[PDB]
Copies of this chain bind each other. A is one copy, B any other.
Amino acid sequence: GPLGSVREEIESLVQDSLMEMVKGVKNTIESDLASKKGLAQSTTEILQLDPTNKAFAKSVLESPNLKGSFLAIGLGYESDATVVENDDGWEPNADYDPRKRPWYVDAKRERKLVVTEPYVDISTKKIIISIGTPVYQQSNFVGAMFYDVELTQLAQLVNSVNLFDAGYLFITTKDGVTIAHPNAENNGEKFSQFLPNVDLKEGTQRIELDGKYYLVKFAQVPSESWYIGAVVDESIAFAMV
């Protein structure tokens, strides 16, 4: 056990908290996504019993349980770029082409159910992930569907945990864009503005920022390709143990 027996206990405790958040993120988000996946899949299959029937589509997407399980649900058509949608607070722009949206492109490309990476919603302007499913009349691609999922539980998980008064946990994208933070205004920004000179990589990093010493640990969430980050002030943490 090399130099820093109190410093290798901090690192060990941060690793403990980091691992629980990893399991914590999986046990909430992934189990929720799995539930929402099957719901989106059945909805897609039921809808292509009569895909061009947009009245039937609106009827299904206005169904209370389905309507209350997602932020918003919609269908974009290939030929028309017509959008059937169930959000009582959103209607397409003059400029809104579904066929060039991330959930659409992914669904058409994979020819199966897809999940997008965190992007900022157009109506809500919050960062969300969307469940994308392709729609087929009968082997002919007519369009794709979006099932918006707000990352609320990520905001709750991160807020709850306090790394023994020395720091906090946070979540970024694969490109280091913050999506969950105790202070929510860091969301949408690259984590380099509140935590500069830190590489987005799994493992342990130690840096000095203007007279302060910080301990940083990153872990990945393989299924959603997110990074979970842990920061503490090593000086405060050291004296505390």
Using an 8 Å CB-CB cutoff, how does the interface string of A14-51 with B read, 1 for contact, 0 for none? 00000000000001000100110011011101100100
The number of times this chain is found in the oligomer is: 2
Q: Are A60 and B49 in contact (CB under 8 A)?
A: yes
The answer to whether the Cβ of A192 comes within 8 Å of any Cβ in the partner chain is no
| Contact segment of A61-69, A85-93, A153-161 | A61-69
Docked complex Cα distance between A43 and B38 (Å): 12
Docked complex Cα distance between A42 and B49 (Å): 16
The answer to whether the Cβ of A59 comes within 8 Å of any Cβ in the partner chain is yes
Docked complex Cα distance between A80 and B59 (Å): 27
Total contacting residues, chain A, CB less than 8 A:
19
* Chain B contacts for A60, CB-based, 8 A: 46, 49
Q: Are B59 and A49 in contact (CB under 8 A)?
A: yes
Using an 8 Å CB-CB cutoff, how does the interface string of A176-208 with B read, 1 for contact, 0 for none? 000000000000000000000000000000000
Docked complex Cα distance between A166 and B63 (Å): 53
* Chain B contacts for A63, CB-based, 8 A: 42, 45-46, 49
Q: Are B38 and A65 in contact (CB under 8 A)?
A: yes
Known: A46-B63, A49-B60, A60-B46. A38 touches B41 (CB 8 A): no
* Chain B contacts for A65, CB-based, 8 A: 38, 41-42, 45
Q: Are B31 and A45 in contact (CB under 8 A)?
A: no
The answer, among B27, B42, B45, for a CB contact under 8 Å with A42, is B42
When C-beta atoms are compared, the residue in chain B nearest to A49 turns out to be B59
* Chain B contacts for A39, CB-based, 8 A: 35, 38-39, 42
Q: Are A42 and B66 in contact (CB under 8 A)?
A: yes
Q: Are A46 and B45 in contact (CB under 8 A)?
A: no
A-B residue pairs in contact (CB < 8 Å), sample of 19: A31-B31, A34-B35, A35-B35, A35-B38, A35-B39, A38-B69, A39-B39, A39-B42, A42-B65, A42-B69, A45-B63, A45-B64, A45-B65, A45-B66, A46-B46, A46-B66, A49-B59, A49-B60, A49-B63
Instruction: For the A-B complex with A31-B31, A38-B65, A38-B69 known, give 11 more contacts whose Cβ atoms are closer than 8 Å.
Output: A34-B35, A35-B35, A35-B39, A38-B39, A42-B42, A42-B63, A42-B69, A45-B63, A45-B64, A46-B63, A49-B60
